[PDB]
Amino acid sequence: ALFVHRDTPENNPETPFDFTPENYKRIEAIVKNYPEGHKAAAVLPVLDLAQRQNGWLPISAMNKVAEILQVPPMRVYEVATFYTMYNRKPVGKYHIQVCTTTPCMLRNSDSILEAIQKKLGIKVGETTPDKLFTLIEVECLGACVNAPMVQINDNYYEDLTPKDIEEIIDELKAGKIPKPGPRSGRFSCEPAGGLTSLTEPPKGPGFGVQAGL
Amino acid sequence: KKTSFGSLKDEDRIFTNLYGRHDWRLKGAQSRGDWYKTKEILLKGPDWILGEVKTSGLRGRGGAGFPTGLKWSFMNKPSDGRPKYLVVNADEGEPGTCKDREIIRHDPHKLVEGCLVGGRAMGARAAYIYIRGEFYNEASNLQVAIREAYEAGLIGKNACGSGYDFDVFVVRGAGAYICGEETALIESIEGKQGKPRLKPPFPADVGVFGCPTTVANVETVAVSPTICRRGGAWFASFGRERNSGTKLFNISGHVNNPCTVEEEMSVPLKELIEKHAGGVTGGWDNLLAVIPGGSSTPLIPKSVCETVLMDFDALIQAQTGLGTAAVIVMDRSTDIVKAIARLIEFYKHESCGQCTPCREGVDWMNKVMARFVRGDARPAEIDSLWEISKQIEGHTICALGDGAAWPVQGLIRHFRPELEERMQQFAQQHQ
Amino acid sequence: SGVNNTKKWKMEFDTRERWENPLMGWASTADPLSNLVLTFSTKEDAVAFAEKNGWSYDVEERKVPKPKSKSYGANFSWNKRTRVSTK
Ligand SMILES: Cc1cc2nc3c(=O)[nH]c(=O)nc-3n(C[C@H](O)[C@H](O)[C@H](O)COP(=O)(O)O)c2cc1C
Ligand code: SF4
Ligand code: FES
């Protein structure tokens, strides 16, 4: 949790990184989304791309993005250390992120944190010896009505209970892909035990349209 | 006039695929009435569209609640040579708020159509949809929905066949609540730290890439096509005067059935919780406090919750605000000081650090509130914390500073005896 | 940044030899005027005082900071170099 860089044998400007040819084509499309003369707007998406290819951001990757976009390296470092989704240390294969802000706290997200810690034998902020799971607390993930919820890599797992989360870790260790979403009865954000709205057939085109178009 | 509000009907609900029970891709969206007579709306001109939005009484759904037709009309002016843009705020970062998430993934074509309709009103050439980076799957749904519209001629060159060129770009965030702030969002698009800008200049003059920009919430833009189709008067027939239309509500916390639901504005808070959320856990009598509009709004105790309505003007009178309309319910088992202390901890982790009162003050408030949770303080410190919050409020660059102060003030305003009691317990234990 | 010490005119005299005291190394002087500094409201007041006391003098014209054109908006220019890369 430090915001200074000290070169180490596995993280220095000579650490091998470079985009694959497939990613170099994705980068071209990213840059075309912005006006000519404002290529620096691509810093966030291109940095994220480097992390998706590599899993984390060595300083060499930051320099590579700076070189590609012709942006001073410090301006890339500033972005990398501001946004919390960028990993400047290697993380596990599965980055478990437990929301602990108040709405999730009110639904016993602490029990979810306990279940993950007891099952994995690690503490918040640590990685397992096998380097499969890294566990952190995060702020509201925009799924508060489905609390308690966690994010693992790109997926949300919601309305959790200590049992449900323990199963998901079993599925990940075994190599399977657990389907995202609520683990209770419901499918998304509707009230449990039956809809209280949107029960009628949706109205079709042209319904209630004002005269004169 | 109408005197009671609520009991909205499905016939009059804008977001009809709120629960993902129907197809979210273009075929489903069209059958539900999206993209219908979009060409007619575009050929009626910006002044007609802004008038429809002006007459609808729509107010910003992002939190500030600023009237939308007036705000969008700031772009209604001759071009000086720069391009014009509509930035759509899909950051959805306010704790308790998840309404924009359902719109993006289940009704993406309403947002995409809203981008074009609102973009036409402002004369914008494209819309950038800034969606928080943690919504990867929702962002992929939106790009799929955007691809279908491009392939149907509904956007891009000669959009809908109106002779109007409009692009819809999706750009993802990288983890920062402060990038929901309008100007901090713009700096993020430009590839900088998400730090807000001072105003003036206002974004309608100098915005993204230094160009005229309007930042609109996802919900504000997603309802815009329907208001144009069904008319502003239809939308204005809902909710109290100046508090018009249908609102998305998130009821979370200590309810039986936490959910997102669309309900008429000015619905009573009590009715909303009982009707849709199944009521407070342990009975309505087990209610302690409610945060009515997301974490930034001050809480209210059970007594106020009894009769308060859910709209901008009603909640201002209760010394709070509608905010994002995210209702966080706390029953009597809650450690209220701990619950509010966790929100101040959230603002501490989300402050961009740019400006002094929030960079230093919020962290100071967090350190004090942590001691209040344990009672390791003195009663005189309560008035000191109130004064500190007033030194943050109204002195910072952006409204995150105000949003950190208000929860603290709400706790002190309604639960001061609880704070003093905890200090009494701590003092007598170490006595 | 404070400018409160640039309000008044000063008259000082030419610096003369200081040497090290053999016993202690302190700074010795034989110039009785080494610490004499007078304050005047205007340049004319200072010159008049110097003339009547018989001192030759040099007058240096007051330096006033140039008036600058500041604009927060320029930091985000669409097409100018004043666009800042960081805040
Ligand atoms: C700290 C902070 C976070 C914000 N987050 C969001 C957000 O996630 N979504 C949003 O629409 N508005 C957010 N806002 C409000 C925006 O600054 C802005 O008022 C709003 O996006 C304008 O859109 P509207 O007029 O349609 O409501 C936030 C404001 C602050 C101060
Ligand atoms: S109030 Fe906080 S988040 Fe807003 S600009 Fe100041 S330091 Fe940044
Ligand atoms: S409080 Fe956890 S998702 Fe919002």
Side-chain angles (χ1 to χ4, degrees):
Chain A
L2 297 209
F3 296 105
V4 291
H5 173 74
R6 282 182 262 281
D7 280 332
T8 73
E10 43 67 64
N11 189 6
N12 65 82
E14 263 84 343
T15 290
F17 173 88
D18 191 7
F19 291 96
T20 63
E22 252 74 339
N23 282 318
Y24 266 117
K25 298 201 164 267
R26 282 141 180 167
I27 287 168
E28 272 176 26
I30 288 165
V31 164
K32 296 256 287 210
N33 292 349
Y34 312 107
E36 295 157 62
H38 295 276
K39 275 190 64 162
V43 166
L44 264 74
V46 175
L47 254 191
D48 197 66
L49 174 52
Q51 181 168 274
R52 274 166 192 284
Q53 165 177 308
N54 202 65
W56 68 289
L57 289 184
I59 197 81
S60 50
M62 292 171 204
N63 301 345
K64 177 58 63 172
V65 176
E67 144 181 12
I68 275 186
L69 304 177
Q70 306 136 225
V71 153
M74 187 67 210
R75 302 305 168 236
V76 178
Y77 304 155
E78 288 188 72
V79 164
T81 60
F82 183 87
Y83 296 98
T84 55
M85 293 186 33
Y86 293 126
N87 310 309
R88 299 175 288 125
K89 309 287 224 75
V91 291
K93 179 149 140 62
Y94 298 111
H95 200 186
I96 299 152
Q97 284 139 124
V98 190
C99 175
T100 57
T101 316
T102 290
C104 280
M105 193 191 74
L106 289 170
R107 315 275 308 175
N108 204 7
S109 74
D110 309 289
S111 52
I112 306 307
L113 209 51
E114 273 148 35
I116 302 153
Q117 283 175 110
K118 183 216 193 311
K119 168 151 201 89
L120 284 165
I122 49 140
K123 304 265 155 267
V124 176
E126 312 192 352
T127 297
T128 54
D130 69 359
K131 316 203 143 178
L132 279 206
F133 304 96
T134 283
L135 173 65
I136 48 152
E137 294 165 36
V138 302
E139 299 306 339
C140 176
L141 285 161
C144 325
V145 306
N146 281 113
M149 65 84 57
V150 307
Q151 171 180 34
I152 308 173
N153 290 345
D154 281 339
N155 290 297
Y156 280 15
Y157 306 91
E158 331 177 81
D159 315 322
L160 293 171
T161 69
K163 185 199 216 177
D164 311 291
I165 185 62
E166 276 148 346
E167 297 171 39
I168 293 167
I169 297 170
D170 297 341
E171 291 199 72
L172 290 175
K173 299 164 131 297
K176 294 188 247 289
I177 169 54
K179 50 98 191 162
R183 315 299 273 195
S184 69
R186 64 177 159 171
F187 306 132
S188 51
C189 70
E190 77 286 30
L195 304 180
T196 71
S197 67
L198 295 177
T199 53
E200 318 288 80
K203 295 290 193 285
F207 172 85
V209 160
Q210 77 192 267
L213 317 188
Chain B
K1 302 289 197 303
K2 216 198 286 178
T3 173
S4 89
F5 308 96
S7 319
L8 190 84
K9 285 169 272 290
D10 292 341
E11 31 160 44
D12 304 4
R13 272 180 171 82
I14 289 177
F15 299 100
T16 48
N17 193 37
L18 188 64
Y19 299 131
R21 302 296 195 74
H22 315 302
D23 182 20
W24 59 270
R25 291 164 299 160
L26 176 53
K27 217 185 143 289
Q30 272 172 321
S31 91
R32 291 193 299 276
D34 296 322
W35 291 114
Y36 171 97
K37 280 187 176 8
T38 319
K39 184 162 65 66
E40 276 56 82
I41 299 167
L42 294 172
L43 278 315
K44 257 152 145 54
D47 286 48
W48 185 87
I49 295 174
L50 292 162
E52 291 294 323
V53 171
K54 269 179 208 214
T55 270
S56 67
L58 181 64
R59 291 178 67 173
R61 301 310 209 238
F66 190 94
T68 306
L70 203 80
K71 166 168 161 194
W72 289 8
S73 77
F74 290 118
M75 301 272 280
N76 210 31
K77 71 196 150 169
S79 299
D80 41 31
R82 291 170 297 163
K84 294 164 69 176
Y85 293 107
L86 164 61
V87 171
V88 173
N89 199 327
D91 200 67
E92 189 78 317
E94 174 87 296
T97 319
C98 34
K99 67 199 167 71
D100 299 333
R101 191 203 179 192
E102 313 310 336
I103 297 156
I104 286 150
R105 66 179 170 161
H106 295 147
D107 272 298
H109 281 278
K110 298 191 107 83
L111 183 64
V112 173
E113 181 177 13
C115 285
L116 176 72
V117 164
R120 178 74 204 82
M122 308 165 203
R125 65 167 286 147
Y128 292 86
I129 302 176
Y130 190 99
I131 181 160
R132 71 183 292 169
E134 297 104 326
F135 287 170
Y136 182 84
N137 284 325
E138 300 81 2
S140 303
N141 269 27
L142 185 64
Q143 293 266 76
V144 166
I146 277 156
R147 188 180 55 188
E148 294 168 349
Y150 268 124
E151 284 168 323
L154 307 166
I155 50 175
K157 175 180 285 302
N158 195 39
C160 291
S162 69
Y164 196 81
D165 323 303
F166 200 69
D167 282 309
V168 180
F169 300 104
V170 180
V171 294
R172 304 181 43 252
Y177 164 70
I178 188 52
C179 285
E181 211 269 348
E182 43 160 7
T183 61
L185 197 167
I186 281 167
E187 301 279 280
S188 207
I189 289 166
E190 302 173 3
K192 283 172 268 179
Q193 302 162 317
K195 297 182 165 180
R197 304 176 173 174
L198 277 73
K199 286 169 293 221
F202 292 89
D205 284 310
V206 176
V208 71
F209 317 121
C211 294
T213 309
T214 294
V215 190
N217 179 242
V218 153
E219 196 191 336
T220 309
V221 171
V223 307
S224 106
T226 300
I227 287 165
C228 290
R229 263 195 283 291
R230 300 177 74 154
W234 171 82
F235 195 73
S237 67
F238 295 114
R240 280 202 298 156
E241 209 57 20
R242 267 178 318 279
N243 301 258
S244 306
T246 61
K247 183 73 184 66
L248 282 176
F249 291 90
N250 310 290
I251 304 122
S252 79
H254 286 149
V255 287
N256 282 301
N257 300 326
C259 64
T260 302
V261 65
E262 176 166 11
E263 189 48 79
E264 185 180 3
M265 284 264 321
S266 304
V267 56
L269 170 55
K270 187 166 183 279
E271 166 166 5
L272 175 80
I273 294 162
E274 313 228 90
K275 189 174 214 278
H276 301 286
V280 180
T281 290
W284 174 259
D285 284 0
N286 200 45
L287 183 64
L288 177 52
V290 163
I291 287 154
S295 61
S296 311
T297 62
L299 60 89
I300 37 173
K302 162 161 153 271
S303 80
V304 173
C305 292
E306 284 299 335
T307 68
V308 73
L309 307 183
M310 302 283 321
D311 63 25
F312 302 98
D313 297 353
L315 285 163
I316 283 162
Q317 272 295 110
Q319 308 163 293
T320 174
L322 182 67
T324 57
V327 185
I328 308 154
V329 172
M330 284 163 279
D331 70 44
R332 277 169 128 190
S333 85
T334 311
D335 185 350
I336 196 65
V337 188
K338 182 169 179 150
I340 302 307
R342 185 66 189 70
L343 291 183
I344 307 309
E345 204 218 52
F346 160 87
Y347 290 105
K348 215 273 284 184
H349 296 312
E350 299 310 317
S351 155
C352 87
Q354 169 166 219
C355 78
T356 314
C358 169
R359 177 188 56 255
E360 308 298 328
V362 170
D363 177 81
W364 184 358
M365 283 202 303
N366 186 43
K367 276 180 192 204
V368 173
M369 281 280 341
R371 290 196 288 106
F372 279 11
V373 169
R374 313 190 326 263
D376 179 30
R378 280 163 26 224
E381 292 193 55
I382 300 160
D383 282 342
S384 175
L385 177 52
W386 180 276
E387 291 208 341
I388 285 156
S389 83
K390 290 277 167 189
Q391 285 167 194
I392 301 167
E393 193 198 330
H395 298 86
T396 60
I397 285 169
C398 93
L400 191 152
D402 305 321
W406 289 331
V408 150
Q409 289 168 11
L411 183 74
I412 289 164
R413 188 188 293 124
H414 293 305
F415 288 94
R416 185 189 238 282
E418 172 59 50
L419 299 164
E420 305 212 351
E421 211 187 315
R422 211 163 292 192
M423 306 178 194
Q424 203 284 135
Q425 270 147 220
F426 183 95
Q428 85 89 235
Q429 266 159 220
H430 299 59
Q431 260 167 14
Chain C
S1 295
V3 298
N4 206 50
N5 285 330
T6 68
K7 302 297 189 199
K8 300 277 143 191
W9 288 82
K10 295 293 170 306
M11 169 177 317
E12 62 172 4
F13 291 83
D14 54 294
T15 293
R16 304 221 155 174
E17 186 184 39
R18 293 165 172 103
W19 66 95
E20 298 169 89
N21 168 245
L23 184 60
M24 299 300 305
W26 295 333
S28 313
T29 202
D31 173 10
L33 304 182
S34 69
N35 295 307
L36 173 47
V37 188
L38 307 163
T39 317
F40 296 93
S41 320
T42 74
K43 184 214 297 195
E44 289 73 36
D45 296 332
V47 166
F49 196 84
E51 301 235 289
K52 73 170 158 183
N53 281 286
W55 295 311
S56 52
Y57 60 88
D58 295 311
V59 185
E60 321 202 351
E61 207 39 58
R62 185 194 275 276
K63 281 195 174 70
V64 196
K66 226 163 45 156
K68 275 108 198 155
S69 315
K70 309 303 296 182
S71 182
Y72 186 70
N75 301 344
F76 327 102
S77 189
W78 157 241
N79 57 1
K80 298 284 174 278
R81 285 163 183 164
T82 57
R83 173 162 267 266
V84 306
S85 39
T86 195
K87 294 222 300 310

